């Protein structure tokens, strides 16, 4: 459950550190993004070197939500915090090159393969 | 790392575990002696010193503690076991 | 920095990549360097014959 405003941590290099969701893309009036959805983003923190700089506007992939995820059977995965992987505005597709912290099976997408190839877990 | 004399790594490991365990007990024995001094028991001090002397010497020989260390222990342990005891 | 372009004529325009020399022009206060003719994107002086080593002009075909 991510929604406009809401700070997210970032799970890649690129160098964002802290980032804010300025839109839940994908539908009129769509309230929440979570799981492995895409959101428009404005960088709030940014390391000094880094691909991205503060004030940039990009997209990103929700990779960990505290409300977590369910899928079949009835179980739950919850993560302590909210994190995402920055995507280039045109091609989706991570602008980063390393992923940090575990990611979930749901992300097993054509476009998000590069994330689960990286990333040390689930 | 691709230099096969990395057997040195697996080798000197066996070494560390061996050294560790022997070096461990010779310490716990030296302790037993200091304990006696703290307990005040003149008998157990000179008794425990007799038990530890061979250990300290043997290990020094085997090259785990080295000579002058061996000396220094029985040296000032003695100093103390017969300073009030 | 501002730099001198010696010899009669030159190519040399807004994007030319040159090699700057050092050596003033005491008619041009502020101009403290020469641009080395014949180096990189600067051509040598057309049709010159004497002192060709300065002005980057090659020997004309013995």
């Amino acid at each position: 459950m991510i929604q406009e405003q809401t700070m997210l941590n970032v799970a890649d290099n690129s160098g964002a550190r802290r980032v804010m969701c300025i839109k839940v893309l994908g539908g009129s009036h769509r309230r929440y993004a979570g799981v492995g959805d895409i959101i428009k983003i404005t960088i709030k923190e940014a390391i000094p070197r880094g691909k991205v700089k503060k004030g940039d506007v990009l997209k990103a992939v929700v990779v960990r939500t505290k409300k977590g995820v369910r899928r079949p059977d009835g179980s739950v995965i919850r993560f302590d915090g909210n994190a995402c992987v920055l995507l280039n505005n045109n091609s989706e597709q991570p602008i980063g090159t390393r992923i940090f912290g575990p990611v979930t099976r749901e992300l097993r997408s054509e476009k998000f393969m590069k994330i689960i190839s990286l990333a040390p877990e689930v | 790392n691709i230099k096969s004399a990395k057997k040195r790594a697996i080798q000197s490991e066996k070494a560390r575990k061996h050294n560790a365990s022997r070096r461990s007990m010779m310490r716990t024995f030296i302790k037993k002696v200091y304990a006696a001094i703290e307990a005040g028991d003149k008998a157990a001090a000179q008794k425990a010193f007799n038990e530890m002397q061979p250990i300290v010497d043997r290990q020094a020989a085997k090259g785990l503690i080295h000579k002058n260390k061996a000396a220094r222990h029985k040296a000032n342990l003695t100093a103390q076991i017969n300073k009030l005891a | 920095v501002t730099s001198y372009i010696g010899g009669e004529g030159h190519n040399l325009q807004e994007h030319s990549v040159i090699l700057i020399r050092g050596g003033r022009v005491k008619d041009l206060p502020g101009v403290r360097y020469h641009t080395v003719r014949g180096a990189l994107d600067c051509s040598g002086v057309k049709d010159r014959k004497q002192a060709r080593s300065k002005y980057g002009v090659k020997r004309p075909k013995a």
């Binding site: - | - | 807004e14 994007h15 990549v17």
Partner: protein, 671 residues
């Protein structure tokens, strides 16, 4: 050292219109040859039938845009496999690669790909090669059915209906005989295959007239003799996708495409001195001579320089000569791209191709010859760009780097060009077309990380007057405090006609007996001169102006060079104001060369482009159209000229004159 097979060398390049499979078909080879963009691989013949032959393949671009990649990719190598879409007929860029093959008289066979596709029709296309390309086809084969009912092919030499099987893609065979369907068709060959083979030599056909069925061995030699002499194009057909056909075509390569010795020895020159064909027989024991086609740069080994060795040999360390630059190079590591591995080499013989690592300054077209036996070779031709567009480095910082990068892309692609407009100093690139330009700029982002946006090039406008203006008056009189200084001048300003090349400006000393001394008269000229560098309408040079002195006045002392120089300056103004000034624009002598079919559309567009037409010839096959059309209006012509003439239409332009710009233009051109 020793070498190995030699003279069993097949230097062939695949090229054709877009789609077609001219690449898919190439990968298919590497599969077949590799049982158990330049590459090499070994074909023993699909049946085991052959002594292993060594094949150098080059998959070329379709498209135009990158036609340069075919000039080079056909100049150097010996054979050519022209691919055709079973569905798409000849199509425009088939004709262009045809002309490029003819330009270099390169022997060639033909492969009608995609027989499995809806609307497939082998013999139709074969006929278009005859009709549209004015060439002599010879169906060396026949298709077993068509489109989704495409099951095989007929070797109509060996007269058997070749059968490729289900799995293992290719390989296997069982060489089945013709089916009852085609026996009628099959009993042709184009009997003028065998009658085409006949025409090699009359003593070869004399027995054909005498009804003597020719031996299989003597036919293959027969039509090959004529393939080599490019009087015949064998057609093979197949479908890379179904794996039903590619293989039979490889055989046709060794059967009917040259060795490096079935070849005219190279032409050329000596250095300073004069001609002589450089000759140099295709022989290992000749003096080394090679041409450099294609330059690249790999991030790990540095500069790669592809060459074709026509004569002699080079060993890693031999210091050859770039004859067309008058400097020597020392060969180092050598690489052959070897199906899928940059295999290393210490020696490279004649008749082979490879890329030389580390060579310093060797551009495309240069000859690498023996230093004792220097020769210049032919050098292909450089297609000459048709499109220009101005570029600026998005980030002012990058402006330096944009310079570096465009430079690099130039020495890699001679068909690409870059320069700086002598006026309105903006960076201008030029290429063989819209797409060409696109991927160049894109290549900057990828490889040099300079993104830059693009725009229409600026235009150099000029200024003039239209009315002779009668005696206008200039005057100075500076009683201020210092140098006395006073000058007075009266003149006539009048338009000219485009006269005497260098001037475009005319000053006349029709001064009275001595109303102004002739020592100050140079000055009054200088004063006008100054005003011409950027006239009063909108900067921009003033042209085609004439000026006549007639009257003035001075003090015996106060007047001076300066005084009249200003007086003239003032006299020029007010006179210009009253002279009905106008904004000029530049026009081009434009020459469009187009087919008969669409000279209607082309004319109309030239007209639409605010253009004047002036002639038509009907020069042979196209129709040269002559027109005067303004510059600020020809931008991106290539792109549309193509659309209007199916890609088939050269054109050319250069400066001609300046004419009045239409008002809405003029008032727009306001800075």
């Amino acid at each position: 050292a020793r070498t190995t097979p030699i003279a069993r060398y097949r230097n062939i390049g695949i090229s054709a219109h877009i789609d077609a499979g001219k690449t898919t078909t190439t990968e298919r080879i590497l599969f077949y040859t590799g049982v158990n963009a330049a590459t090499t691989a070994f074909w023993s013949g699909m049946a085991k039938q052959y002594e292993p032959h060594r094949i150098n393949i080059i998959d070329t671009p379709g498209h135009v845009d990158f036609t340069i990649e075919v000039e080079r990719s056909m100049r150097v190598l010996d054979g050519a496999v022209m691919v055709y879409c079973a569905v798409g007929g000849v199509q425009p860029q088939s004709e262009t690669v045809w002309r490029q093959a003819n330009k270099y008289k390169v022997p060639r066979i033909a492969f009608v790909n995609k027989m499995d596709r809806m609307g497939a029709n082998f013999l139709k296309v074969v006929n278009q090669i005859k009709t549209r390309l004015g060439a002599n086809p010879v169906p060396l084969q026949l298709a077993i059915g068509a489109e989704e009912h495409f099951t095989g092919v007929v070797d109509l030499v060996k007269m058997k209906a070749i059968n490729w099987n289900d799995a293992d893609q290719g390989v296997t065979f069982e060489y089945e005989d013709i089916p009852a369907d085609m026996v009628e068709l099959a009993n042709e060959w184009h009997q003028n295959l065998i009658e085409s083979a006949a025409e090699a030599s009359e003593e070869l056909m004399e027995k054909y007239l005498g009804g003597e069925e020719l031996t299989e061995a003597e036919i293959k030699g027969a039509l090959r003799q004529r393939v080599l002499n490019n009087e015949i194009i064998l057609v093979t057909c197949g479908s890379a996708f179904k794996n039903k056909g590619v293989q039979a075509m490889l055989d046709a390569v060794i059967d009917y495409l040259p060795s490096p010795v079935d070849v005219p020895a190279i032409n050329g020159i000596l250095d300073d001195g004069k001609d002589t064909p450089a000759e140099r027989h295709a022989s290992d024991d000749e003096p080394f001579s090679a041409l450099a086609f294609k330059i690249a740069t790999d991030p790990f080994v540095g500069n790669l320089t592809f060459f074709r060795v026509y004569s002699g040999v080079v060993n890693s360390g031999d210091t050859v000569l770039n004859s067309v630059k008058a400097a020597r190079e020392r060969f180092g590591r050598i690489v052959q791209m070897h199906a899928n591995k940059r295999e290393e080499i210490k020696e490279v013989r004649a008749g082979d191709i490879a890329a030389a690592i580390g060579l310093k300054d060797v551009t495309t077209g240069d000859t690498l010859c023996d230093p004792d036996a220097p020769i210049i070779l032919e050098r292909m031709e450089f297609p000459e760009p048709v499109i220009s567009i101005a570029v600026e480095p998005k980030t002012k910082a990058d402006q330096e780097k944009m310079g570096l990068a465009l430079g690099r892309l130039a020495k890699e692609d001679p068909s690409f060009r870059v320069w700086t407009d002598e006026e309105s100093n903006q960076t201008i690139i030029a290429g063989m077309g819209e797409l060409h330009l696109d991927i160049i700029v894109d290549r900057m982002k990828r490889e040099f990380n300079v993104e830059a946006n693009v725009g229409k090039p600026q235009v150099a406008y000029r200024e003039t007057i239209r009315q002779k203006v009668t005696d206008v008056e200039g005057k100075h009189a500076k009683q201020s405090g210092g140098r006395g200084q006073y000058g007075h001048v009266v003149i006539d300003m009048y338009p000219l006609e485009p006269g005497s090349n260098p001037k475009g400006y005319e000053f006349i000393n029709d001064i009275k007996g001595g109303v102004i001394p002739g020592e100050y008269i140079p000055a009054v000229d200088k004063g006008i001169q100054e005003q011409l560098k950027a006239g009063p309408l909108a900067g921009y040079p003033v042209v085609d102006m004439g000026i006549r002195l007639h009257f003035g006045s001075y003090h015996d002392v106060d007047s001076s060079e300066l005084a009249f120089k200003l007086a003239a300056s003032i006299a020029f103004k007010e006179g210009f104001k009253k002279a009905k000034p106008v904004l000029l624009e530049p026009i081009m002598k434009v020459e469009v060369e187009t087919p008969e079919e669409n000279t209607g559309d082309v004319i109309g567009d030239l007209s639409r482009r605010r253009g004047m037409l002036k002639g038509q010839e009907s020069e042979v096959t196209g129709v040269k159209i002559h027109a005067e059309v303004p510059l600020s209006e020809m931008f991106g012509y290539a792109t549309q000229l193509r659309s209007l003439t199916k890609g088939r239409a050269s054109y050319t332009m250069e400066f001609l004159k300046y004419d009045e710009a239409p008002s809405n233009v003029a008032q727009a051109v306001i800075e």
